[PDB]
Amino acid sequence: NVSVPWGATLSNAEHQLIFYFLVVAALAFVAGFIRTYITRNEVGSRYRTAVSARLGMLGVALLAYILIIVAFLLGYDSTAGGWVPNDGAINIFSTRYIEWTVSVPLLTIELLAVCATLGVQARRNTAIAVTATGAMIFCGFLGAIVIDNGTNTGAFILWAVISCVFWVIANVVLIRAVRQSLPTLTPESHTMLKSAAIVLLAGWVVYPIVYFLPLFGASGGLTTTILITLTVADVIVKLGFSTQTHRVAKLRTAEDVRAGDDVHPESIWISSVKQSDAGLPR
Amino acid sequence: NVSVPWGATLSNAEHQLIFYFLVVAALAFVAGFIRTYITRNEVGSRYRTAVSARLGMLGVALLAYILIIVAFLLGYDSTAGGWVPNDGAINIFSTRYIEWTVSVPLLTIELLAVCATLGVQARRNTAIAVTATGAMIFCGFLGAIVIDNGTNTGAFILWAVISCVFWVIANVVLIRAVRQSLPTLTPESHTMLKSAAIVLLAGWVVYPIVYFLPLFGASGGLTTTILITLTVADVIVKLGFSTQTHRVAKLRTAEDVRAGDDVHPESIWISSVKQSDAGLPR
Amino acid sequence: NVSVPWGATLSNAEHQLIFYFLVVAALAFVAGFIRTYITRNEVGSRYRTAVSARLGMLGVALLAYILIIVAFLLGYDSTAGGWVPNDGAINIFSTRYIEWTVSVPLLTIELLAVCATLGVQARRNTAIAVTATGAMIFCGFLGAIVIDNGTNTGAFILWAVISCVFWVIANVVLIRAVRQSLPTLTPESHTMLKSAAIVLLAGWVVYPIVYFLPLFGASGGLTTTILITLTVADVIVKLGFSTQTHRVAKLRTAEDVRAGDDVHPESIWISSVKQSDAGLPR
Amino acid sequence: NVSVPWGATLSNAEHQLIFYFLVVAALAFVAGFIRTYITRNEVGSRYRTAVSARLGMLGVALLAYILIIVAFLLGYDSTAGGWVPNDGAINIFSTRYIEWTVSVPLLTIELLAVCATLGVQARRNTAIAVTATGAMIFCGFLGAIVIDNGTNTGAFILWAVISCVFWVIANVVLIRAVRQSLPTLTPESHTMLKSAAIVLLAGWVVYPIVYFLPLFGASGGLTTTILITLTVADVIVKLGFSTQTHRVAKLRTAEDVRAGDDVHPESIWISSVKQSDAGLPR
Amino acid sequence: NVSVPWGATLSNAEHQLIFYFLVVAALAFVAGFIRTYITRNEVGSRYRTAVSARLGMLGVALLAYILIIVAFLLGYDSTAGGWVPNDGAINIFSTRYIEWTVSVPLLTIELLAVCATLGVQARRNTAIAVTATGAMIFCGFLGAIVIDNGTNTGAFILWAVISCVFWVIANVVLIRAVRQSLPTLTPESHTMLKSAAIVLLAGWVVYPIVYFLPLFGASGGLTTTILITLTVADVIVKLGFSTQTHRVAKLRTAEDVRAGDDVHPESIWISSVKQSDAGLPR
Ligand SMILES: *C\C=C(C)/C=C/C=C(C)/C=C/C1=C(C)CCCC1(C)C
Ligand SMILES: *C\C=C(C)/C=C/C=C(C)/C=C/C1=C(C)CCCC1(C)C
Ligand SMILES: *C\C=C(C)/C=C/C=C(C)/C=C/C1=C(C)CCCC1(C)C
Ligand SMILES: *C\C=C(C)/C=C/C=C(C)/C=C/C1=C(C)CCCC1(C)C
Ligand SMILES: *C\C=C(C)/C=C/C=C(C)/C=C/C1=C(C)CCCC1(C)C
């Protein structure tokens, strides 16, 4: 059966670890937001979407993680028997689905931004991906939170299945876009995009796995394993992979500048190598 | 007869779904605000008003949606019989009228900003539209919230009628402005404006319809349908259509640059096609 | 006698209307703040003071209106007999005097910024105006709030009289500055300043009138009329007239650019007419 | 004996006046912060420290004054016998010492920034001044707040004496720096610095005087006089004198530009006279 | 044996001093954040990482210190017997470990940013350092907070030992990077980096020492000594040493500009000496 994670009483260790990771995440996102803002003009206007998506995703994550922290502080009470969940502990689990609903479509927008697609294909791509990913999150939220208060095993499973269909649709769309890109890019750029895609699409699998952990039992330790693992995953994907597309966009900006297709006000540096020189509109 | 939406007790599913959409909206607006800010200089000084209106509308929406979220958390209490409305549940419904009062006039300002009107006509247009739209919202607020606490069917209806007159005035003004524009623009620009207008003016109809749903009865289902539908509509219109005028303004900037009427510091890209090159004041 | 406004019990309609206007104001100011910030570089460095004053005034208004909203939510308690003022309701009335104390001197700074005055006269002007206006607000605050808790009719009147002397001093100073300007400006600029002054100085009269309403009796109606009217006045003067000086400053920037006295990085547009072209320091 | 200021019960007038000045200060600082930010690029990179110090000081003041306002609202309760101090009223007095601890060293940094000192002397100057001033504040905090809860007359006095030694050290350092500057500046610049120093160093005396007013007795009148006087002093020194160094820095920037030692992207204006023209790096 | 710091009752002096330092820190960080932001463009794009890391670290510190202040206000209750720790007092100690978890890896990123390393070595360096330092903090958090609620002496010690291994790894990595840099830099730059490294790595020792103070007993004195000393250390290292790398980055920018390897829009000043002139992309 499904044993909802927010039913469990947390040990002190457990409650302490959760607060640590939750706040470390929020602070890492603040740092990431600052970095992304300070470096927004390393990218040409042609790829500004990549930058905006990413800065958006980091802002969203930062706010969502503030809510999660509030929900956590207002969701358990120390009672000699550790910390006992109140009726707002479900909101620690809900807010995360909230956050993914915005953030994951932003990720698709970012990745498509640095691909080589034009016109209808590019608008079709962005429509299907943003749709399929928000649907994928919402189906999850249905199974895990909304129907029967999380407790209906058949709902819980069936909605995860539906969710997995939207997950395959999103991937196919993205994977195809990245692989219609690669023929038109330069070796260095081809490589960079291929690698960014993989990094950006591979760690999605974590989420579905964590989703099904409520099936193996209910414990404060299982709850801590769920909340922590999701927090780490979010930091790795949103923060850790926040520079993959930035490097792609920078190396693309620089190639345009070297081809005389554009100019850029400052030199561009990637891995401490100069990619392009500063130049003025001539 | 009118059954006010804030009278109904919400199931857990219902209360969970509402919080989801409300917060997803707030987070989508934060993302939108960041995008609009990061891309404010893609537009020439001639059309900066379009940008400011839009960035204003997104900032307003973001704050309004924070209030709505507060009002929601402070408006229902879990009581075994789901969530029971308290005396601040009306403020969940009131805050939205508040938000439209600023946001809808901002929308009119934005659309007129990218039209081809000069002098008195342009000042008359903006005066009538900003007036007619704020009046339209306020009449709504009267019928639905203020008179008799929402419960007077004849008020509720009569004020919606008055509201619909201000709605026709606004449309006529706007529609005429857009159609005095189109003769002077270029094919590509003509098309773009025509389409932006339609997108921007068509989904207004949703609001009046939702307004009259408190007449079909009272339920937490119905209450939930109301709050969600309004949230989706807001996201579609404020966020979804936040780029229509931006593209119009960009393509207008670029045409000036190509005509030698202006210069722009960076190249302009629309749908991954280069519209204009960067240039310096010569 | 004086019947203090914060003594009255508010109907539900009344309490609803007040919250509407108060929050609509705050949101309008957020929009205004964003506009003013986004357009700060339409003005040359010579007139940057106008811009800073205005952006300051809008920031102040936005914060003050947040306080007023708090004070309102924490100042009346629903009790079957509508909303009954607690002992913090006075703070709804006090915060507004607070706000004017900063905002009105900012207005004088803004208007003098776009006048044609040099050296001692300009420093004397700004000193007398900023003094006379802050004094004018403080005398008001004395009569209405501080002495006898607002209830002393002779105080209430006598301090309003004193306040009116500082009001005449401020006007004389300002009016003379604007009329020593006009001889040195261009027709187009002369006209623009004259008009901005009138708009900026005419709606001051509202405030003194509203000030003496507590003398015609006490009612929640009267209390509501007071709070709303002040809110509308603030929006009209701070937001509505936030572009008068901006246009003046823009047309002055542009005239310098056309005379070859300065350069400006971007073209300047006023009412959809181009005033000056972009240019580089030569 | 010392009668601590936070022991006194405040009349309604008194409590009203205090809240007025405290919030007027916070709002004035917001305005000042906005001005300083909007005008940060009127100064060359050579004197950017002056700007950063000042913008820092205004940000600090704004936050400190928000705390003081909180502390005030949470420090007295209306009890028929006016407002009666709780055991957090001391924090109204403590927060101010907190604020000076950052702000006064920032002031020294700002003033030294616009002086003509190089190498060791400049690093020695900044070290002694920042040290002596933070020490001066902390000694004050000891005598007034920490030892014996403020109530030890001999502590109170002895720590103020120590504090006055650090005050003389700071002045000597600063005064000497300003007077080793003046021989190397231009008449116009010499004059400007001399005047800025005097303005910046003269109103320090207020603070020590107010410090000893708890020795003349205890009253809500006296308590009110203390809190208001400190608030006015802060506004005069932090806000009122926030442009003295800015003018100094601007006139220094402009002189470099006129000497061909630097360039500046925009013209520089001081008192409505043009000081330097815009120019590009040649 | 370990006597947890959050067990002790604080005298009034003690509670007053702690609040002072905690808030002085937060305010110093706000000032630092403003400085770093205002001066972000003194550094070339090649070394922007240094700037972003530092601005990130200061933003993180500012938020962390706000939490610590909250935790403090909500962690002790005045009970005639001074201030008595409640059960959130542990969170005053926990939040600091939280803060170091982000901030210390940011410090390593900053220092490596201004070193002369390319390709794999630079990516290996940053990976090991960011890992080793976050591990070092987390091991600390285990021993001090999580296991046995802080009270297990053998845990407390053993985890500090493990922590010290990660501390040696981090240092070796960093020290080697800085000393593979120095052969390729200029005298002036070599010197500057060597000095920045020492300053940046030397005051790490404080933290481990303070960590083992809970072993010398329990007291409010000892508790106070701990919290203050950590606060001062943080201010010295995060704020005090926030300019070391900035100077390094500036002098490196300037050397590139003098070599004709880059251009920089503004002149660069270090210690009131001009390092490079402004220039345009040629
Ligand atoms: C914050 C960033 C990311 C990439 C979060 C991703 C979330 C998913 C990939 C969720 C997928 C789900 C599936 C496919 C099936 C079970 C329900 C889930 C929503 C967890
Ligand atoms: C937030 C964006 C938009 C466009 C909101 C629009 C609101 C309306 C178009 C409201 C119209 C009304 C009418 C015409 C009649 C009933 C009362 C309403 C206020 C709902
Ligand atoms: C927020 C903007 C404005 C211009 C507010 C203005 C306030 C006044 C002009 C107040 C004037 C007063 C007078 C002359 C006499 C009675 C007391 C008052 C303060 C209301
Ligand atoms: C916020 C700005 C300023 C300049 C505040 C200044 C504070 C002082 C100059 C304080 C001086 C003190 C002395 C010399 C002796 C008594 C203790 C004091 C801290 C009040
Ligand atoms: C906020 C800035 C800094 C540099 C903080 C540094 C923290 C450490 C160097 C901590 C080291 C530890 C060790 C090596 C052993 C005991 C556990 C500690 C985490 C305190």
Side-chain angles (χ1 to χ4, degrees), chain A residues 1-86 88-120 122 124-175 177-187 189-281, chain B residues 1-86 88-120 122 124-175 177-187 189-281, chain C residues 1-86 88-120 122 124-175 177-187 189-281, chain D residues 1-86 88-120 122 124-175 177-187 189-281, chain E residues 1-86 88-120 122 124-175 177-187 189-281:
Chain A
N1 212 101
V2 206
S3 319
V4 299
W6 52 83
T9 277
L10 301 175
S11 83
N12 272 343
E14 284 164 358
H15 183 272
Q16 212 57 46
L17 285 169
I18 289 151
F19 173 75
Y20 180 79
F21 290 98
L22 291 180
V23 180
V24 169
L27 286 187
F29 294 128
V30 164
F33 186 94
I34 287 161
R35 192 230 305 105
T36 299
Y37 185 75
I38 262 36
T39 63
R40 65 198 185 296
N41 301 311
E42 302 183 339
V43 168
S45 67
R46 185 165 187 182
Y47 309 100
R48 181 169 299 117
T49 294
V51 173
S52 65
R54 182 49 66 160
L55 188 58
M57 161 192 335
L58 283 158
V60 162
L62 183 265
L63 295 191
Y65 269 75
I66 288 163
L67 303 189
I68 298 168
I69 291 160
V70 165
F72 176 77
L73 293 183
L74 303 196
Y76 298 70
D77 327 62
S78 206
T79 56
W83 298 72
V84 161
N86 50 243
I90 187 160
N91 281 43
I92 304 164
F93 297 75
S94 271
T95 306
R96 196 157 271 168
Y97 285 94
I98 286 170
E99 181 225 17
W100 300 337
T101 311
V102 177
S103 76
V104 179
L106 283 179
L107 190 183
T108 66
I109 285 161
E110 193 168 357
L111 178 60
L112 284 171
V114 296
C115 293
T117 179
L118 304 179
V120 189
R124 285 175 186 165
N125 286 351
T126 297
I128 299 173
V130 166
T131 293
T133 59
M136 177 187 82
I137 300 318
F138 178 70
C139 293
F141 183 71
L142 286 184
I145 303 273
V146 166
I147 299 169
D148 297 344
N149 315 265
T151 82
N152 177 23
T153 295
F156 175 85
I157 286 168
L158 183 266
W159 287 99
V161 170
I162 290 168
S163 198
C164 288
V165 172
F166 289 118
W167 173 34
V168 180
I169 282 160
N171 279 8
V172 163
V173 165
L174 292 170
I175 286 177
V178 166
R179 274 177 58 163
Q180 266 170 349
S181 293
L182 291 197
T184 89
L185 305 196
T186 68
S189 271
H190 163 126
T191 289
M192 242 199 213
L193 182 63
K194 180 175 174 187
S195 321
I198 292 164
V199 174
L200 253 28
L201 292 182
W204 281 21
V205 193
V206 179
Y207 288 96
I209 288 163
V210 173
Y211 179 93
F212 289 93
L213 282 181
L215 285 191
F216 305 111
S219 301
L222 215 245
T223 299
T224 310
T225 315
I226 292 155
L227 290 167
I228 280 173
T229 301
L230 292 174
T231 307
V232 170
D234 281 7
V235 169
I236 293 173
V237 163
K238 295 181 216 303
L239 221 233
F241 301 169
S242 64
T243 45
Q244 296 293 296
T245 34
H246 193 75
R247 298 169 81 260
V248 167
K250 287 176 61 183
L251 167 49
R252 281 253 257 156
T253 309
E255 284 174 338
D256 294 4
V257 170
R258 287 194 309 265
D261 299 356
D262 224 315
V263 301
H264 196 258
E266 58 159 56
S267 53
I268 294 171
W269 294 84
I270 295 173
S271 297
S272 313
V273 182
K274 198 181 203 192
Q275 297 306 317
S276 67
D277 306 356
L280 286 171
Chain B
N1 215 101
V2 206
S3 319
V4 299
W6 52 83
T9 277
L10 301 175
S11 83
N12 272 343
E14 284 164 358
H15 183 272
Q16 212 57 46
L17 285 170
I18 289 151
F19 172 76
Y20 180 79
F21 290 98
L22 291 180
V23 180
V24 169
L27 286 187
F29 294 129
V30 164
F33 186 94
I34 287 161
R35 192 230 305 105
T36 299
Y37 185 75
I38 262 36
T39 63
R40 65 198 185 296
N41 300 311
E42 302 183 339
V43 168
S45 67
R46 185 165 187 182
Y47 309 100
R48 181 169 298 118
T49 294
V51 173
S52 65
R54 182 49 66 160
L55 188 58
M57 165 195 329
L58 283 158
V60 162
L62 183 265
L63 295 191
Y65 269 75
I66 288 163
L67 303 189
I68 298 168
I69 291 160
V70 165
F72 176 77
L73 293 183
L74 303 196
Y76 298 70
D77 321 63
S78 206
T79 56
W83 296 72
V84 158
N86 63 62
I90 187 160
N91 281 44
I92 304 164
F93 297 75
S94 271
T95 306
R96 196 157 271 168
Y97 285 94
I98 286 170
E99 181 225 17
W100 300 337
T101 311
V102 178
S103 76
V104 179
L106 283 179
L107 189 180
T108 66
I109 285 161
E110 193 168 357
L111 179 60
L112 284 171
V114 296
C115 293
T117 178
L118 303 181
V120 186
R124 284 195 318 238
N125 286 351
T126 297
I128 298 173
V130 166
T131 293
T133 59
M136 177 187 82
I137 300 318
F138 178 70
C139 293
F141 183 71
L142 286 184
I145 304 273
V146 165
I147 299 169
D148 297 344
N149 316 87
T151 82
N152 177 23
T153 294
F156 175 84
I157 286 168
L158 183 266
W159 287 99
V161 170
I162 290 168
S163 198
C164 288
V165 172
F166 289 118
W167 173 34
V168 180
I169 282 161
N171 279 8
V172 163
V173 165
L174 292 169
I175 286 177
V178 166
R179 129 198 309 255
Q180 266 171 348
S181 294
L182 291 196
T184 89
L185 305 197
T186 68
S189 271
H190 163 126
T191 289
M192 242 199 213
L193 181 63
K194 180 176 176 183
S195 324
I198 292 164
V199 174
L200 252 28
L201 292 182
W204 281 21
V205 194
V206 179
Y207 288 96
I209 288 163
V210 173
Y211 179 93
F212 289 93
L213 283 177
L215 281 190
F216 301 107
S219 318
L222 205 276
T223 290
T224 289
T225 307
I226 289 162
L227 290 166
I228 280 173
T229 301
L230 292 174
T231 307
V232 170
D234 281 7
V235 169
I236 293 173
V237 163
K238 295 181 216 302
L239 221 233
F241 301 169
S242 64
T243 45
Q244 296 293 296
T245 34
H246 193 75
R247 298 169 81 260
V248 167
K250 287 176 61 183
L251 168 49
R252 281 253 257 156
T253 309
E255 284 174 338
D256 294 3
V257 170
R258 287 194 309 265
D261 299 356
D262 224 315
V263 301
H264 196 258
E266 58 159 56
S267 53
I268 294 171
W269 294 84
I270 295 173
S271 297
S272 313
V273 182
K274 198 181 203 192
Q275 297 306 317
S276 66
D277 306 356
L280 286 171
Chain C
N1 212 101
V2 206
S3 319
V4 299
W6 52 83
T9 277
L10 301 175
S11 83
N12 272 342
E14 284 164 358
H15 183 272
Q16 211 58 48
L17 285 169
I18 289 151
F19 172 75
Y20 180 79
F21 290 98
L22 291 180
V23 180
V24 169
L27 286 188
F29 294 129
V30 164
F33 186 94
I34 287 161
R35 192 230 305 105
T36 299
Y37 185 75
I38 262 36
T39 63
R40 65 198 185 296
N41 301 311
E42 302 184 339
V43 168
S45 67
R46 185 165 187 182
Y47 309 100
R48 181 169 298 118
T49 294
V51 173
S52 65
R54 182 49 66 160
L55 188 58
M57 165 195 329
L58 283 158
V60 162
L62 183 265
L63 295 191
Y65 269 75
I66 288 163
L67 303 189
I68 298 168
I69 291 160
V70 165
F72 176 77
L73 293 183
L74 303 196
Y76 298 70
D77 314 59
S78 198
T79 54
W83 299 71
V84 161
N86 63 62
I90 187 160
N91 281 43
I92 304 164
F93 297 75
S94 228
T95 306
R96 196 157 270 167
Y97 285 94
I98 286 170
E99 182 225 17
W100 300 337
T101 311
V102 178
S103 76
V104 179
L106 283 179
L107 190 182
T108 66
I109 285 161
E110 193 168 357
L111 178 61
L112 284 170
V114 296
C115 293
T117 309
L118 302 181
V120 188
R124 285 175 185 165
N125 286 351
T126 297
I128 298 173
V130 166
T131 293
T133 59
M136 177 187 82
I137 300 318
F138 179 70
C139 293
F141 183 71
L142 286 184
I145 304 274
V146 166
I147 299 169
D148 297 344
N149 315 265
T151 82
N152 177 23
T153 295
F156 174 85
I157 286 168
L158 183 266
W159 287 99
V161 170
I162 290 168
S163 198
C164 288
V165 172
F166 289 118
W167 173 34
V168 180
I169 282 161
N171 279 8
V172 163
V173 165
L174 292 170
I175 286 177
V178 166
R179 89 185 290 112
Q180 266 169 351
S181 294
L182 291 196
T184 89
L185 305 196
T186 68
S189 271
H190 163 126
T191 289
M192 242 199 213
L193 182 63
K194 180 177 176 186
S195 320
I198 292 165
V199 174
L200 252 28
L201 292 182
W204 281 21
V205 193
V206 179
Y207 288 96
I209 288 163
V210 173
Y211 179 93
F212 284 105
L213 281 186
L215 285 191
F216 301 107
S219 318
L222 205 276
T223 290
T224 289
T225 307
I226 289 162
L227 290 166
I228 280 173
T229 301
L230 292 174
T231 307
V232 170
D234 281 7
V235 169
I236 293 173
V237 163
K238 295 181 216 303
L239 221 233
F241 301 169
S242 63
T243 45
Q244 296 293 296
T245 34
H246 193 75
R247 298 169 80 260
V248 167
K250 287 176 62 183
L251 167 49
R252 281 253 257 156
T253 309
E255 284 174 338
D256 294 4
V257 170
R258 287 194 309 265
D261 299 356
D262 224 316
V263 300
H264 196 258
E266 104 203 352
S267 52
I268 294 171
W269 294 84
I270 295 173
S271 297
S272 313
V273 182
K274 198 181 203 192
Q275 297 306 317
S276 67
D277 306 356
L280 286 171
Chain D
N1 212 101
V2 206
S3 319
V4 299
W6 52 83
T9 277
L10 301 175
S11 83
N12 272 342
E14 284 164 358
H15 183 272
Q16 212 57 46
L17 285 170
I18 289 151
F19 172 76
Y20 180 79
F21 290 98
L22 291 180
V23 180
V24 169
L27 286 187
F29 294 129
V30 164
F33 186 94
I34 287 161
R35 192 230 305 105
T36 299
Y37 185 75
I38 262 36
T39 63
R40 65 198 185 296
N41 300 311
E42 302 183 339
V43 168
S45 67
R46 185 165 187 182
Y47 309 100
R48 181 169 298 117
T49 294
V51 173
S52 65
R54 182 49 66 160
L55 188 59
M57 164 195 329
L58 283 158
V60 162
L62 183 265
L63 295 191
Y65 269 75
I66 288 163
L67 303 189
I68 298 168
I69 291 160
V70 165
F72 176 77
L73 293 183
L74 303 196
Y76 298 70
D77 324 63
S78 208
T79 56
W83 297 71
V84 161
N86 52 244
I90 187 160
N91 281 43
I92 304 164
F93 297 75
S94 271
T95 306
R96 196 157 270 168
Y97 285 94
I98 286 170
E99 181 225 17
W100 300 337
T101 311
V102 178
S103 76
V104 179
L106 283 179
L107 187 178
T108 65
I109 285 162
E110 193 168 357
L111 179 60
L112 284 171
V114 296
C115 293
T117 309
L118 302 180
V120 184
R124 184 191 302 162
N125 286 351
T126 297
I128 299 173
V130 166
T131 293
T133 59
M136 177 187 82
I137 300 318
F138 179 70
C139 293
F141 183 71
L142 286 184
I145 304 273
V146 166
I147 299 169
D148 297 344
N149 316 87
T151 82
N152 177 23
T153 295
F156 175 84
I157 286 168
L158 182 266
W159 287 99
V161 170
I162 290 168
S163 198
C164 288
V165 172
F166 289 118
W167 173 34
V168 180
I169 282 160
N171 279 8
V172 163
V173 165
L174 292 169
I175 286 176
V178 165
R179 89 149 47 200
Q180 266 170 348
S181 294
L182 291 196
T184 89
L185 305 196
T186 68
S189 271
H190 163 126
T191 289
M192 242 199 213
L193 181 63
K194 180 176 175 184
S195 321
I198 292 165
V199 174
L200 252 28
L201 292 182
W204 281 21
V205 194
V206 179
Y207 288 96
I209 288 163
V210 173
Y211 179 93
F212 289 93
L213 281 179
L215 283 191
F216 303 111
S219 318
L222 205 276
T223 290
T224 289
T225 307
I226 289 162
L227 290 166
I228 280 173
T229 301
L230 292 174
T231 307
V232 171
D234 281 7
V235 168
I236 293 173
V237 163
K238 295 181 216 303
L239 221 233
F241 301 169
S242 64
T243 45
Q244 296 293 296
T245 34
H246 193 75
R247 298 169 81 260
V248 167
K250 287 177 61 183
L251 168 49
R252 281 253 257 156
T253 309
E255 284 174 338
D256 294 4
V257 170
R258 287 194 309 265
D261 299 356
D262 224 315
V263 301
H264 197 257
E266 58 160 56
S267 307
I268 294 171
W269 294 84
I270 295 173
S271 297
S272 313
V273 182
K274 198 181 203 192
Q275 297 306 317
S276 67
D277 305 356
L280 286 171
Chain E
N1 215 101
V2 207
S3 319
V4 299
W6 52 83
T9 277
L10 301 175
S11 83
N12 272 342
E14 284 163 358
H15 183 272
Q16 212 57 46
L17 285 170
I18 289 151
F19 172 75
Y20 180 79
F21 290 98
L22 291 180
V23 180
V24 169
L27 286 187
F29 294 129
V30 164
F33 186 94
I34 287 161
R35 192 231 305 105
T36 299
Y37 185 75
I38 262 36
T39 63
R40 65 198 185 296
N41 300 311
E42 302 183 339
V43 167
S45 67
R46 185 165 187 182
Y47 309 100
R48 181 169 298 118
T49 294
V51 173
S52 65
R54 182 49 66 160
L55 188 59
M57 165 195 328
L58 283 158
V60 162
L62 183 265
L63 295 191
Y65 269 75
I66 288 163
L67 303 189
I68 298 168
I69 291 160
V70 165
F72 176 77
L73 293 183
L74 303 196
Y76 298 70
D77 314 59
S78 205
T79 58
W83 296 72
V84 157
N86 68 60
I90 187 160
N91 281 43
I92 304 164
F93 297 75
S94 228
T95 306
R96 196 157 270 168
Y97 285 94
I98 286 170
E99 181 225 17
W100 300 337
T101 311
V102 177
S103 76
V104 179
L106 283 179
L107 189 180
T108 66
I109 285 161
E110 193 168 357
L111 179 60
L112 284 171
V114 296
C115 293
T117 179
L118 303 180
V120 184
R124 284 191 303 196
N125 286 351
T126 296
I128 299 173
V130 166
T131 293
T133 59
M136 177 187 82
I137 300 317
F138 179 70
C139 293
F141 183 71
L142 286 184
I145 304 274
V146 166
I147 299 169
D148 297 344
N149 315 265
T151 82
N152 177 23
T153 295
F156 174 84
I157 286 168
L158 183 266
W159 287 99
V161 170
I162 290 168
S163 198
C164 288
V165 172
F166 289 118
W167 173 34
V168 180
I169 282 160
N171 279 8
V172 163
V173 165
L174 292 170
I175 286 177
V178 165
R179 89 149 46 200
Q180 266 171 348
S181 294
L182 291 196
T184 89
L185 304 197
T186 68
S189 271
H190 163 126
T191 289
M192 242 199 213
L193 182 63
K194 180 175 174 185
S195 322
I198 292 165
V199 174
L200 252 28
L201 292 182
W204 281 21
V205 194
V206 179
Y207 288 96
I209 288 163
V210 173
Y211 179 93
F212 288 101
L213 283 186
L215 287 187
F216 301 107
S219 318
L222 205 276
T223 290
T224 289
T225 307
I226 289 162
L227 290 166
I228 280 173
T229 301
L230 292 174
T231 307
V232 171
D234 281 7
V235 169
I236 293 173
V237 163
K238 295 181 216 302
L239 221 233
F241 301 169
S242 63
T243 45
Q244 296 293 296
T245 34
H246 193 75
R247 298 169 81 260
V248 167
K250 287 176 61 183
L251 168 49
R252 281 254 257 155
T253 309
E255 284 174 338
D256 294 4
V257 170
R258 287 194 309 265
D261 299 356
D262 224 315
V263 301
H264 196 257
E266 58 159 56
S267 53
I268 294 171
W269 294 84
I270 295 173
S271 297
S272 313
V273 182
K274 198 181 203 192
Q275 297 306 318
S276 66
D277 306 356
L280 286 171

